[PDB]
Amino acid sequence: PNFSGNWKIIRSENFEELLKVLGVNVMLRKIYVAAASKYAVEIKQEGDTFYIKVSTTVYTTEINFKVGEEFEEQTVDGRPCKSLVKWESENKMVCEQKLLKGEGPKTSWTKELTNDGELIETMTADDVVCTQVFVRE
Numbered sequence: 001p002n003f004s005g006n007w008k009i010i011r012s013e014n015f016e017e018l019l020k021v022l023g024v025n026v027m028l029r030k031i032y033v034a035a036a037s038k039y040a041v042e043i044k045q046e047g048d049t050f051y052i053k054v055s056t057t058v059y060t061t062e063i064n065f066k067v068g069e070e071f072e073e074q075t076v077d078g079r080p081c082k083s084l085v086k087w088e089s090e091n092k093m094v095c096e097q098k099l100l101k102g103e104g105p106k107t108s109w110t111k112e113l114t115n116d117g118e119l120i121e122t123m124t125a126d127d128v129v130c131t132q133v134f135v136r137e
């Protein structure tokens with residue numbers, strides 16, 4: 001698979017529930033959900049090396065990793081973490097995260113390329129899974 005693309009979100013489910021697990025207060029959850037329903041993921045994939053640029057209207061962040069090599073990024077609720085990405089299958093990867101400081105719910109994310117041209121992302125905090133779907137623009 002080639003995950004490279006300028007991905008635009010078309011669906012987002014269970015994001016508020018995810019943020020609730022992470023302890024984000026309700027007022028702040030609603031505006032975070034609002035930012036998510038119009039946010040973008042740009043991916044450049046070169047073999048097992050990935051360059052990810054995630055952005056909203058006012059914020060952008062770059063995440064660069066190689067499958068199987070630990071890197072540093074941040075959790076959904078904005079805390080620094082050490083991350084490790086592995087393939088689960090031909091078209092799906094999974095990232096496990098460990099907080100650099102403190103404790104919290106266990107968090108992870110996945111990316112999957114479907115046969116029909118979609119990118120499915122998930123983000124997990126303990127038992128709650130958020131699922132987001134993107135198409136190329």
Ligand SMILES: *C\C=C(C)/C=C/C=C(C)/C=C/C1=C(C)CCCC1(C)C
Binds near residue numbers: 032036041054063075
């Ligand atoms: C797909 C791979 C990675 C590392 C994605 C990381 C995504 C984020 C840090 C996204 C954060 C945001 C969300 C979930 C929705 C809108 C607001 C943010 C850009 C802060």
